[PDB]
Paper text:
The HIV-1 envelope (Env) spike, a trimer of gp120-gp41 heterodimers, is the only target of neutralizing antibodies (Abs). As exemplified by VRC01, the first such bNAb to be isolated, VRC01-class bNAbs share a common mode of gp120 binding in which the VH1-2*02-derived variable heavy (VH) domain mimics CD4. Two forms of designed gp120-based immunogens were subsequently engineered to bind and activate germline HC/LC VRC01-class B cell receptors: gp120 outer domain-only constructs (eOD-GT6 and eOD-GT8) (Jardine et al., 2013; 2015) and gp120s modified from the clade C 426c Env (McGuire et al., 2013; 2014; 2016). Here, we present crystal structures of inferred germline VRC01-like Abs alone and complexed with 426c-based gp120 immunogen cores and compare and contrast their gp120 recognition with structures of mature VRC01-class Ab/gp120 complexes.
3BNC60GL contained 38 HC and 25 LC substitutions in addition to a four-residue deletion in HC framework region 3 (FWR3HC) and a four-residue insertion in CDRL1 compared with 3BNC60MAT. As expected, the germline-reverted Abs did not bind detectably to 93TH057 gp120, but NIH45-46GL bound to both 426c.TM1ΔV1-3 and 426c.TM4ΔV1-3 gp120s with equilibrium dissociation constants (KDs) of ~0.7 and 3 μM, respectively. As previously described (McGuire et al., 2013; 2014), 3BNC60GL did not bind to 426c.TM1ΔV1-3, but showed detectable binding to 426c.TM4ΔV1-3 gp120. Crystal structures of NIH45-46GL bound to 426c.TM1△V1-3 and 3BNC60GL bound to 426c.TM4△V1-3 were solved to 3.4 Å and 3.1 Å resolution, respectively. The 426c.TM4△1–3 structure was solved using crystals of the gp120 core alone and again as part of the analysis of the 3BNC60GL/426c.TM4△V1-3 crystals in which the crystallographic asymmetric unit included two copies of unbound 426c.TM4△V1-3 gp120 along with two copies of the 3BNC60GL/426c.TM4△V1-3 complex. The new germline Fab/gp120 structures, NIH45-46GL/426c.TM1△V1-3 and 3BNC60GL/426c.TM4△V1-3, showed interface interactions in which the germline Fab contacts with the CD4-binding loop and loops D and V5 of the gp120 outer domain were similar to those observed for mature VRC01-class Fab/gp120 complexes. The 3BNC60GL complex with 426c.TM4△V1-3 gp120 includes an additional main chain hydrogen bond between Gly57HC and Gly365gp120 that is not made in the 3BNC117MAT/gp120 complex. In addition, superimpositions of bound and unbound 3BNC60GL Fab showed no major structural changes except in CDRL1, which either flipped the backbone conformation of the Asp28LC-Asn31LC segment (in the case of one Fab/gp120 complex in the crystallographic asymmetric unit) or was partially disordered (in the case of the second Fab/gp120 complex in the asymmetric unit), thus avoiding clashes with loop D of gp120 despite a four-residue insertion in CDRL1.
Author numbering:
A (entry chain G): 45 to 124, 198 to 301, 324 to 396, 412 to 492
B (entry chain I): 47 to 86, 92 to 124, 198 to 301, 324 to 396, 412 to 490
C (entry chain H): 1 to 52, 52A, 53 to 72, 72A, 72B, 72C, 73 to 100, 100A, ...
D (entry chain L): 3 to 25, 29 to 207
Amino acid sequence: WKEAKTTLFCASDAKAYEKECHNVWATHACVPTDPNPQEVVLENVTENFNMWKNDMVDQMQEDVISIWDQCLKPCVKLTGGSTLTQACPKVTFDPIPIHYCAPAGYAILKCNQKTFNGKGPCNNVSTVQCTHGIKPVVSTQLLLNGSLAEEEIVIRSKNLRDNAKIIIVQLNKSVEIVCTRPNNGDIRQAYCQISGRQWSEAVNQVKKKLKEHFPHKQISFQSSSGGDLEITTHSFNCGGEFFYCNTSGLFNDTISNATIMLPCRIKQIINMWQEVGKAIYAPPIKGQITCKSDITGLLLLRDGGDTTDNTEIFRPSGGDMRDNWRSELYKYKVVEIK
Amino acid sequence: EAKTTLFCASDAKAYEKECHNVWATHACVPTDPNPQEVVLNFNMWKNDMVDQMQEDVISIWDQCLKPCVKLTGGSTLTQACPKVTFDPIPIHYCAPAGYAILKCNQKTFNGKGPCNNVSTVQCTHGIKPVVSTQLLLNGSLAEEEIVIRSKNLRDNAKIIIVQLNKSVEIVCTRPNNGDIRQAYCQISGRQWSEAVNQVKKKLKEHFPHKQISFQSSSGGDLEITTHSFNCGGEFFYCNTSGLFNDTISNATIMLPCRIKQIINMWQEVGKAIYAPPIKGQITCKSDITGLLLLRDGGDTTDNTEIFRPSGGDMRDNWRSELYKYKVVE
Amino acid sequence: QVQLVQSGAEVKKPGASVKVSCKASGYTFTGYYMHWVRQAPGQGLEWMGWINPNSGGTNYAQKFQGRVTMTRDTSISTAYMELSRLRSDDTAVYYCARERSDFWDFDLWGRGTLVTVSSASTKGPSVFPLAPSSKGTAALGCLVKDYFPEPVTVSWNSGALTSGVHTFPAVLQSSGLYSLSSVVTVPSSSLGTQTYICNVNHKPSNTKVDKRVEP
Amino acid sequence: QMTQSPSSLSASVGDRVTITCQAISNYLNWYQQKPGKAPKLLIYDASNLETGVPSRFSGSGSGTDFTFTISSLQPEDIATYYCQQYEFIGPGTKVDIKRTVAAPSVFIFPPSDEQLKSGTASVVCLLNNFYPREAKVQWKVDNALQSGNSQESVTEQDSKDSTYSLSSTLTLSKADYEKHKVYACEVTHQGLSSPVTKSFNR
Ligand SMILES: *[C@@H]1O[C@H](CO)[C@@H](O[C@@H]2O[C@H](CO)[C@@H](O[C@@H]3O[C@H](CO[C@H]4O[C@H](CO[C@H]5O[C@H](CO)[C@@H](O)[C@H](O)[C@@H]5O)[C@@H](O)[C@H](O)[C@@H]4O)[C@@H](O)[C@H](O[C@H]4O[C@H](CO)[C@@H](O)[C@H](O)[C@@H]4O[C@H]4O[C@H](CO)[C@@H](O)[C@H](O)[C@@H]4O[C@H]4O[C@H](CO)[C@@H](O)[C@H](O)[C@@H]4O)[C@@H]3O)[C@H](O)[C@H]2NC(C)=O)[C@H](O)[C@H]1NC(C)=O
Ligand SMILES: *[C@@H]1O[C@H](CO)[C@@H](O[C@@H]2O[C@H](CO)[C@@H](O)[C@H](O)[C@H]2NC(C)=O)[C@H](O)[C@H]1NC(C)=O
Ligand SMILES: *[C@@H]1O[C@H](CO)[C@@H](O)[C@H](O)[C@H]1NC(C)=O
Ligand SMILES: *[C@@H]1O[C@H](CO)[C@@H](O)[C@H](O)[C@H]1NC(C)=O
Ligand SMILES: *[C@@H]1O[C@H](CO)[C@@H](O)[C@H](O)[C@H]1NC(C)=O
Ligand SMILES: *[C@@H]1O[C@H](CO)[C@@H](O)[C@H](O)[C@H]1NC(C)=O
Ligand SMILES: *[C@@H]1O[C@H](CO)[C@@H](O)[C@H](O)[C@H]1NC(C)=O
Ligand SMILES: *[C@@H]1O[C@H](CO)[C@@H](O)[C@H](O)[C@H]1NC(C)=O
Ligand SMILES: *[C@@H]1O[C@H](CO)[C@@H](O)[C@H](O)[C@H]1NC(C)=O
């Protein structure tokens, strides 16, 4: 129909009785889900989508800031101007699926093209009230608990020729990953388990898809070049605790066809994504902390400058969580029906 | 005493772009230059005037504060959402002909009982329709001493409206550009600590042999668990953990706030979504003139009676201003 | 005279096939076993297998079993080698060679064919003159820029001019495209007197150039 | 499985050069492979000299130990030498010549008007017929050093006069190119007592 920008509303299945933080935020923020939604296919039609200029992405970012403002309150928040102390309550933390919905007079177009690269024309289109359920999972390097590509791996970037612009990868087959900090030893020490055969195969498939976009070059995977730890490690939050995981064993040109162990630390001193600054959080809760997650996508950064061995080097990256939302919101735009 | 339709008058200016003026001119007649007070049993909890004003304030907001989306179980509604200049202006609600408005001049009327010093006036004083929870803003103060008002103090389910002797200033600000939703309130810890004891003291008069404790909200809608209000068209929600605290700081007190686009409406059951906040510095310097408290029920542990902020029913807000007024035929 | 002539250099996308042909002249084709040997860039020689032209019968190295196919057409004295499911490490020069005796002495080799396994895509060279103004021996040349894949051959004056020619190895640019120079030192006296043309041939794109190099 | 030693060796013209191959016997054949060409069979059945091959090359064997000898190394003998037994081939031995230091001739080439009209500018410096192989070219523009701007390439050792040649190539956009006037390359070699510099005006 007609592209337009407005204020969408969120719907979720949060429960008023549930003490978990995503629920608590959503019960106020969001209305309930429609049990039977109406999707109207357009047969042959063409619309242009731009995942990189999508007002829906910017809305989820402001939303996830609002969630974390309530869930994850740090003991000390450091800003260049100031240092601040506040209450540090531990909380129950498990991301729950969020739907973003169009109000009256507006609709959300959904691209059904099975392998849309995300900026350009869409062949198959439908109109919906709401997006699918998107879990606001904050993470770097590996994209977790998201949606998979229907047909084949897709590579998405604002400018592939520009090395500085992040690469969002969508996988064909998800790979399981389990990170656990066992019950009490070093209470900050943790580990992650990955099937090397499954991850090694996943890598080749993305490497092969990458080679199509750089036909000249050979494709190398390597450990992060450097920067803030949030980015140089696979960083995420599990049960309110911030995990930082060594993915040197993941981004390697020679990967083990065996079970892979990644070392992790629970960190109290972190760099915020929400704003530039540093936060200090409370020491971990007691007991077993575990996350069994689905790796469904990647965030990569390609090395700049002249290639030494006619090799293009790609290293895990991240940091701007909007890209995380783009990995899910690429196929939607808001249009005002007339 | 009779039930009728009062009419409102205000100091509205026809040239003013501020919405309370704009609503007031079409809705409201001019202030009477020459008011008459003629010296000569009331209930603030059973007063038709409150139900009238509530409709007015709904009416004000419908014209001033149109949310971009109104979310109702049946439906979504979308409408023009223009930002506006917002500063409540005092409204005088007046009796139609053949009717008069009685005024309690009583030194300390609890608001349910008999008033001795009565007068007749055509109009009530100018009341600002400040919509808020937990803290009462920009209203009227008690003349003699802090006043406790309830339908029943023995029934913990009935709200407690406290009217203050001496106002406490509150300044809430979103600084000029960071998280544009982030805001803060500044209150003098010394001023507030004294105020609490002076209200804690008055309370011990109704609950003898018990200690008086202040604690944070028990739970409910966010509107009620925080101190919520509108400042310059933007909706503030402020964490009063530092205010309702048995051990308040002598030092300066800073409350964390958020500017919120999604609110639960007090006008009706539903949710409204408003536009993102304006650019620039947003600040409200207000005078805290009263409290909305709820007393904990049950057998007392440590012989302490616990009180917590409450609200949500905006009629309770007007009852804090209309208590001394009755309509007569 | 006694010779093996192979097909020209190739580029093929990964996963594709390549066929190399080898045509033998000046001996009885049926008499000797023909072998194929490949050589990756900068590396040593790797035997791929042999074929018997009487039988058409083959023997392939285990490394390439199921990927290589050796056939022959004794009618035109031609042996064919086909490698399937190419992978980038299959980029190499492929040679056909005759086994002279059961010493496995390969007395006769083809000039060898380069096979670049690469997803995309052929580009003809731009050929720019390297004019000479400096001075009793002057240098001139040809810049053969931005072509793909290897190889290009450069000669001067259609082969008449050979003394003092240096064709450099190609360097692989940051663009993935190759580039090389061919120079020649000549008598300075020659520069007005004699025409200089460099002949650049890039068969993978069927690009052929004659470029006069002027003062 | 095949061994070969040494990997490479330098030798003066006329020297005695000996190569060793380590493998039961038989049979063992020796090949010479020059740059860009196919192998050429020299020695077959360990000791037998192929027809038409100079008498200076020879081979010897005992058991599973073999050796290949050039009695008097000539300039055209720059090549790699491979032993082989059936399918298996040794990693090969690279033989290059040692010679008296030779200075390079130096020439510099401005970008062509052809190339300019397309928007890029390649400047080329030539080092011609020098020895040893070690050499150092650095680019100056208007007295300004450059880095990462250029690529260089070296010929194989010359079969007649045993020298090398070297090309260094300066590439930059037509925009940058016209932002300057004087373009120079500075060659440093053991043959040159003071480092030579060649240059021109845009
Ligand atoms: C990607 O997505 C994946 C899936 O989509 C994510 O993986 C999911 O992760 C969530 C957790 O984030 C999992 O759900 C959780 O399961 C927890 C464990 O569930 C089992 O264990 C229960 C208890 O075990 C004992 O008791 C049973 C008897 O019933 C006995 O058999 C057993 O042997 C053992 O002794 C068991 O009863 C269950 O049925 C399961 O077997 C479960 O405990 C979690 O419940 C949490 O959270 C929920 C809301 O999510 C609450 O309703 C619960 O009360 C409980 O919360 C407690 O923990 C909080 C944090 O510590 C507290 O602060 C809470 O207030 C609460 O604490 C209370 O309860 C404690 C007693 O348990 C008391 O000690 C306290 O004082 C309080 O009373 C939850 O259901 C999914 O299982 C999992 N899915 C998969 C497929 O694995 C993954 O996380 C995602 N990754 C990312 C990055 O997003
Ligand atoms: C309480 O009343 C005063 C006005 O009586 C309000 O102060 C106004 O504040 C706005 C911005 O907040 C300013 O732009 C106006 O200039 C002020 N007007 C006056 C008359 O001072 C104050 O904001 C009110 N507080 C609340 C919570 O509504
Ligand atoms: C802020 O408010 C939330 C709920 O409104 C409450 O849980 C929290 O404890 C408050 N802040 C502090 C410091 O307690
Ligand atoms: C998944 O996509 C890849 C392309 O990256 C493709 O090679 C692979 O066969 C696909 N497999 C399935 C089951 O979709
Ligand atoms: C682990 O990560 C660190 C920092 O993120 C990195 O320097 C290191 O190389 C990784 N592990 C190993 C074994 O190198
Ligand atoms: C990482 O690389 C090294 C070699 O570089 C290898 O030995 C190691 O097993 C690799 N690990 C994984 C998990 O890929
Ligand atoms: C198995 O592991 C080796 C490295 O140990 C690797 O080279 C090979 O490709 C792997 N193959 C599979 C099918 O995983
Ligand atoms: C105000 O009232 C309080 C008690 O309600 C009393 O303690 C205080 O002295 C009064 N102050 C003034 C100035 O009237
Ligand atoms: C409120 O009380 C908490 C502890 O109960 C204390 O840490 C905090 O400083 C108090 N805040 C104020 C403003 O008194």
